[PDB]
PDB file of N, CA and C and ligand atoms in Angstrom:
ATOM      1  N   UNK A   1       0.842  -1.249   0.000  1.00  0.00           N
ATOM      2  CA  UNK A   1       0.000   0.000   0.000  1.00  0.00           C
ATOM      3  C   UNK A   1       0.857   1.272   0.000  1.00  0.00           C
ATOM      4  N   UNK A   2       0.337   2.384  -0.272  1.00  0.00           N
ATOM      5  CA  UNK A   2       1.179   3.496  -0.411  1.00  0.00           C
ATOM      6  C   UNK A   2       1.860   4.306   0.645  1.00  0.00           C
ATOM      7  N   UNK A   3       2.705   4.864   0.078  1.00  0.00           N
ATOM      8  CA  UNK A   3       3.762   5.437   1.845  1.00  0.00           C
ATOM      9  C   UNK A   3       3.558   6.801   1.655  1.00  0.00           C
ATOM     10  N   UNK A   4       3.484   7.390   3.052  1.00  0.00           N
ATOM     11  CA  UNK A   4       3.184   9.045   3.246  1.00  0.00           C
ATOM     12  C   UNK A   4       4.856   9.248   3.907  1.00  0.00           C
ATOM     13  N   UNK A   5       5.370  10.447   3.444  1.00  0.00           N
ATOM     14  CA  UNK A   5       6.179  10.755   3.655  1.00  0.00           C
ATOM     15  C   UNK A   5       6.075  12.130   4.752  1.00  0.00           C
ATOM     16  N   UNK A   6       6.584  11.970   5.929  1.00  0.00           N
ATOM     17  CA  UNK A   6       6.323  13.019   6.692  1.00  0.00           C
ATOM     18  C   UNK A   6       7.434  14.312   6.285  1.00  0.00           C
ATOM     19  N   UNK A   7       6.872  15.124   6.006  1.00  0.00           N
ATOM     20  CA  UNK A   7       7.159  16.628   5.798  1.00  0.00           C
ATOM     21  C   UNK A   7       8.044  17.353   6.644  1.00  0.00           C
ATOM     22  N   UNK A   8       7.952  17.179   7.580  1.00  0.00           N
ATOM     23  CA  UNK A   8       8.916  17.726   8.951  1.00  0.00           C
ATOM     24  C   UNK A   8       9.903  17.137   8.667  1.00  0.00           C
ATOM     25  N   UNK A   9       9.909  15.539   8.894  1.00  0.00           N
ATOM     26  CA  UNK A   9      11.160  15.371   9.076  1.00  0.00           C
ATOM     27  C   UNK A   9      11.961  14.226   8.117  1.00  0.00           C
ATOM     28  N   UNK A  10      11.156  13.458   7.322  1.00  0.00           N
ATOM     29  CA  UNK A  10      10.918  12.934   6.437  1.00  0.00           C
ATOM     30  C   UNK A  10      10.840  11.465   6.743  1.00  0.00           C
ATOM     31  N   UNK A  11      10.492  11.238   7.705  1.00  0.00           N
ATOM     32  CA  UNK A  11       9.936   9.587   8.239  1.00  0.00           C
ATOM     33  C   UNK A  11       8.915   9.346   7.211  1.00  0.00           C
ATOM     34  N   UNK A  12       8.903   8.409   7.137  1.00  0.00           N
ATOM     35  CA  UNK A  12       8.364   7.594   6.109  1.00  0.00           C
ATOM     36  C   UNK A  12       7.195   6.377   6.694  1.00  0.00           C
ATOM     37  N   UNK A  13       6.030   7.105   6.589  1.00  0.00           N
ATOM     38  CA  UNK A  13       4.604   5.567   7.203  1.00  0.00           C
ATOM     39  C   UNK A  13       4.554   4.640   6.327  1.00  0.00           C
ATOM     40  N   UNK A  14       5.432   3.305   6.299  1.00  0.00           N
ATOM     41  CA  UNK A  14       5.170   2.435   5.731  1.00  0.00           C
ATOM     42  C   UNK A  14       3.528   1.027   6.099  1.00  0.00           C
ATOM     43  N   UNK A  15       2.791   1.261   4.670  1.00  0.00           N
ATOM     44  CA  UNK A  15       1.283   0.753   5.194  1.00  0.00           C
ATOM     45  C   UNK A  15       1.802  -0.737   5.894  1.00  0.00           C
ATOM     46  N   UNK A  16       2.863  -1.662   5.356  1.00  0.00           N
ATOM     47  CA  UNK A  16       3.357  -2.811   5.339  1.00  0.00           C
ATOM     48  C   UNK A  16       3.815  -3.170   6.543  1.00  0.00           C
ATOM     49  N   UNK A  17       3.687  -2.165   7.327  1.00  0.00           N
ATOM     50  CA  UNK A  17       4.407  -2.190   8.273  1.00  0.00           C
ATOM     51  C   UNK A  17       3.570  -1.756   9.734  1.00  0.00           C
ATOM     52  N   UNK A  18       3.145  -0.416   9.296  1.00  0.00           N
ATOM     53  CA  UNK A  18       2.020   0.906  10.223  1.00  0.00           C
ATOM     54  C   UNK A  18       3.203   1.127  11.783  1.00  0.00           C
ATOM     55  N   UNK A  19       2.889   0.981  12.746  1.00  0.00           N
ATOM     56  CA  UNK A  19       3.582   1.474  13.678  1.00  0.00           C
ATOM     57  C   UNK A  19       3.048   0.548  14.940  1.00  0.00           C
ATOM     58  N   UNK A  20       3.100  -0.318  14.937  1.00  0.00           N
ATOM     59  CA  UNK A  20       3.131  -1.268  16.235  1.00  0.00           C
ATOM     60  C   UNK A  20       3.129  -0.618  17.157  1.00  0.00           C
ATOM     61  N   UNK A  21       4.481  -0.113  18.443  1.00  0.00           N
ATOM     62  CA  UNK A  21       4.157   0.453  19.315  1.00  0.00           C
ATOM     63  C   UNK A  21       3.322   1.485  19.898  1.00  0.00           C
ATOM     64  N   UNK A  22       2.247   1.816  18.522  1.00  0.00           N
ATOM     65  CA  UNK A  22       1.726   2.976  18.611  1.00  0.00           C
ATOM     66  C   UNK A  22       0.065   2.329  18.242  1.00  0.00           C
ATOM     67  N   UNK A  23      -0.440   1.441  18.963  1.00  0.00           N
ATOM     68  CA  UNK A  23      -1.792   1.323  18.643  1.00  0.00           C
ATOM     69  C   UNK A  23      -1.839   0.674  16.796  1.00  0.00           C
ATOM     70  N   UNK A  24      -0.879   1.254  16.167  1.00  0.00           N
ATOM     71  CA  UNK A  24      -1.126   0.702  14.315  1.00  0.00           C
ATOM     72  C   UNK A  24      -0.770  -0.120  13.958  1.00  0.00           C
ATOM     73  N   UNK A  25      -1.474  -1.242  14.119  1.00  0.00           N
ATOM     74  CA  UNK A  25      -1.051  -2.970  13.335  1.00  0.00           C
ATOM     75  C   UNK A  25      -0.722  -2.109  11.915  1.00  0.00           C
ATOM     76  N   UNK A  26      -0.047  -3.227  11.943  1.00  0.00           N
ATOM     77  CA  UNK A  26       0.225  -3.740  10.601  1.00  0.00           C
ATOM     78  C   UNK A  26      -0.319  -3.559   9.042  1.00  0.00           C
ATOM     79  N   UNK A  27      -0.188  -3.361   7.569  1.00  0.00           N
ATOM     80  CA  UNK A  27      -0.846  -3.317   7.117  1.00  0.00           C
ATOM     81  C   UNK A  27      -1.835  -2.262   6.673  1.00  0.00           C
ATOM     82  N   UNK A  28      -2.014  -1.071   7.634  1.00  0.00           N
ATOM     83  CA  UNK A  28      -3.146   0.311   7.206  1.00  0.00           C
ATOM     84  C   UNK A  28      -2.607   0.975   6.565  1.00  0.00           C
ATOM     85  N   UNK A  29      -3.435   1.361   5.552  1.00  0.00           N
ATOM     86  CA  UNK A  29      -3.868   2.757   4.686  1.00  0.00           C
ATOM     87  C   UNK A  29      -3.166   3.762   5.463  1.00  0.00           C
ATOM     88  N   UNK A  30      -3.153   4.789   5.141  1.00  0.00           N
ATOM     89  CA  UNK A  30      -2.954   6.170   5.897  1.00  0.00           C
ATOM     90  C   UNK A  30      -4.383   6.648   6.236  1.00  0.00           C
ATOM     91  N   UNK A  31      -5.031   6.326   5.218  1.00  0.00           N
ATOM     92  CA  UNK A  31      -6.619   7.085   5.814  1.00  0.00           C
ATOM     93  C   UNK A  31      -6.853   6.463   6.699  1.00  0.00           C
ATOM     94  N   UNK A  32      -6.837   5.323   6.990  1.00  0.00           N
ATOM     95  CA  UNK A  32      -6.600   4.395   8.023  1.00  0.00           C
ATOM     96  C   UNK A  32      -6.240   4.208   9.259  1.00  0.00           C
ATOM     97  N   UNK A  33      -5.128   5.174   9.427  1.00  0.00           N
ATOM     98  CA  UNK A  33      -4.693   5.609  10.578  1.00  0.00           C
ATOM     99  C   UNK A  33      -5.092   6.339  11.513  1.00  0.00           C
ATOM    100  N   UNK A  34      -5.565   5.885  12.955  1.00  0.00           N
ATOM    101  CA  UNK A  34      -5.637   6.782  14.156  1.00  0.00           C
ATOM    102  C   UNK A  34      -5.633   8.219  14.059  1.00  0.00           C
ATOM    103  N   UNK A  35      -6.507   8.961  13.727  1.00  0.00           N
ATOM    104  CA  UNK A  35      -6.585  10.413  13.502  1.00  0.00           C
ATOM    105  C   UNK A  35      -5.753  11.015  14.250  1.00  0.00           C
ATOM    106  N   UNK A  36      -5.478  10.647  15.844  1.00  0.00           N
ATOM    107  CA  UNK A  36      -4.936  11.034  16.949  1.00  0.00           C
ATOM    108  C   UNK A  36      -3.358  10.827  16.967  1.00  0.00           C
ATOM    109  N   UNK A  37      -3.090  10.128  15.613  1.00  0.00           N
ATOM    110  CA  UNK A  37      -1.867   9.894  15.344  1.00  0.00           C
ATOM    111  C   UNK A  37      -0.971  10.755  14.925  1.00  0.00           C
ATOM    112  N   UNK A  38       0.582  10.619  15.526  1.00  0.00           N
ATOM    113  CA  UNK A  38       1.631  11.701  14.965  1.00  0.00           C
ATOM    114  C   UNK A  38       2.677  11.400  14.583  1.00  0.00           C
ATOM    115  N   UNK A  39       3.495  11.796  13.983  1.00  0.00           N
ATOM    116  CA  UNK A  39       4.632  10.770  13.608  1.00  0.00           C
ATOM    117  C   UNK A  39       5.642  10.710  14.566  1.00  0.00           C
ATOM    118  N   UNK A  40       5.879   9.290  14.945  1.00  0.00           N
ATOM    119  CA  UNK A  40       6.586   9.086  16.076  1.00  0.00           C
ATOM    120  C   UNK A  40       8.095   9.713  16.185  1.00  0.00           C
ATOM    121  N   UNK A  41       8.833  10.397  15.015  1.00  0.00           N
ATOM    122  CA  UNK A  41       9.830  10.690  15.141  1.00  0.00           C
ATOM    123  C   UNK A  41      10.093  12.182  15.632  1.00  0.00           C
ATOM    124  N   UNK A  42       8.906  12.741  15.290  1.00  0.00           N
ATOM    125  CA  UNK A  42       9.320  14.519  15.294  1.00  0.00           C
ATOM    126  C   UNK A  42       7.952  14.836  15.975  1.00  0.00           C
ATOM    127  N   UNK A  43       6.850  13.973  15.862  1.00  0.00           N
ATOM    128  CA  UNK A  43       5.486  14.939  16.350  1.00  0.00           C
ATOM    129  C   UNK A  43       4.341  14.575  15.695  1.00  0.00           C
ATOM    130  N   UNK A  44       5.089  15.627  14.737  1.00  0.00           N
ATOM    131  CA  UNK A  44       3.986  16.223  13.726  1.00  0.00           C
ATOM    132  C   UNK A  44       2.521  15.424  13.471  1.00  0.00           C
ATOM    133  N   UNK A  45       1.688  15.918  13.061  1.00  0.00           N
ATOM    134  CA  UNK A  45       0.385  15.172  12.884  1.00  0.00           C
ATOM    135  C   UNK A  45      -0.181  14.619  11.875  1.00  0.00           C
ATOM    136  N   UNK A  46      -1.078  13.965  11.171  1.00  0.00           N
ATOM    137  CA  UNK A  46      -1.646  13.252  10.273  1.00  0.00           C
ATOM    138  C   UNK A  46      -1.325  14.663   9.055  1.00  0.00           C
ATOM    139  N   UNK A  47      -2.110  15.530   8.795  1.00  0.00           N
ATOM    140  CA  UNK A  47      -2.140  16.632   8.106  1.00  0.00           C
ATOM    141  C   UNK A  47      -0.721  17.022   7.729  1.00  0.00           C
ATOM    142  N   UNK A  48       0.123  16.578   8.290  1.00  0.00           N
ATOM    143  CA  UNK A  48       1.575  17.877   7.690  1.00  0.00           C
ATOM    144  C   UNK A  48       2.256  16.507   6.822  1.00  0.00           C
ATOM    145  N   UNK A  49       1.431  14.990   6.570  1.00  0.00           N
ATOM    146  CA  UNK A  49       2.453  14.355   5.596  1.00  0.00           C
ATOM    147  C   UNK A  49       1.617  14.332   4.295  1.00  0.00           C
ATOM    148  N   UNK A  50       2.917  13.603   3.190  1.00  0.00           N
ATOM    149  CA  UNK A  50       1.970  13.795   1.904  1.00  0.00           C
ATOM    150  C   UNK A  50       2.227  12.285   0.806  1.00  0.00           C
ATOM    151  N   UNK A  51       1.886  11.914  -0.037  1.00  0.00           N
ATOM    152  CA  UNK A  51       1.519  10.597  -0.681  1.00  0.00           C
ATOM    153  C   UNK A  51       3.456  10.889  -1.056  1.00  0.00           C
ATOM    154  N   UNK A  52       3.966   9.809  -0.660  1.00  0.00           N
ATOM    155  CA  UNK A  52       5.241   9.663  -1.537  1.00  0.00           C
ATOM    156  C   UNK A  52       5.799   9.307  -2.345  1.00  0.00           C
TER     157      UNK A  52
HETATM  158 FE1   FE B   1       8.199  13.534  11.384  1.00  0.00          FE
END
């Protein structure tokens, strides 16, 4: 599935992957993702990444 590239800092949400320690099995979309979600490296929030 497709990867959002975070803008701040340029972490990368892989769907194949999502973020385990953070509530996100495996596998999700970005739309998909925990609204409440931020990127675990810098913060930032759903809104500041973009389709990569
Ligand atoms: Fe970031």
């Amino acid at each position: 599935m497709k990867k959002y590239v975070c803008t701040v800092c340029g972490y990368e949400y892989d769907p194949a992957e999502g973020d385990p320690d953070n509530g996100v099995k495996p596998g999700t979309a970005f739309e998909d993702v925990p609204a409440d979600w931020v990127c675990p490296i810098c913060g930032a929030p759903k809104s500041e990444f973009e389709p990569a």
